[PDB]
Design a protein around this ligand. Structure first.
Ligand code: WLF
Length: 135
């Protein structure tokens, strides 16, 4: 029957972005990569098979895919090519994704808010909000 992650499953398209350039700066992304990545209107496809959650992010810039089990650390290569150690957990009904590399850490939270899937990206002082709607 039902599971807490059911509300995230689906195909989602980016419909707004706030402070993403400043967040990518903080994470270490170069000028050319930020300008190009900033144009992207990614889709995000979330699916579940048993305990394995798969998230694809796809755009003209790059396609990425992660598959994971809640709470189990995994190796991820991000869109900007950081090789990170990632752990995704559910905090109530919020998917909390922590990426660690070179002694730095960034937290990405995915939540449902009305008909949207809201993505909050935090690195040190720096917060970006990316809003997706069903495709
Ligand atoms: O890969 C993503 N973003 C991104 C894009 C391009 C570059 Cl160069 C760097 C990144 C980041 F820094 F997030 F890895 N995914 C998100 C998005 O909304 O677009 C942001 C976090 C989870 C969804």
């Amino acid at each position: 029957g039902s599971h807490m992650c059911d509300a995230f499953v689906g195909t989602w398209k980016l419909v707004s972005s706030e402070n993403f350039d400043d967040y990518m700066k903080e994470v270490g992304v170069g000028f050319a990569t930020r300008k190009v990545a900033g144009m992207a209107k990614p889709n995000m496809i979330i699916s579940v098979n048993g305990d394995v959650i798969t998230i694809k992010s796809e755009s003209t810039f790059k396609n990425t895919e992660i598959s994971f089990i809640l709470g189990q650390e995994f190796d991820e290569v991000t869109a900007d090519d950081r090789k990170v150690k990632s752990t995704i957990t559910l905090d109530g009904g919020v998917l909390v994704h922590v990426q660690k590399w070179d002694g730095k850490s960034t937290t990405i939270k995915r939540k449902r808010e009305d008909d949207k899937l809201v993505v909050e990206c935090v690195m040190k002082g720096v917060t970006s909000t990316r809003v997706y709607e069903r495709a």
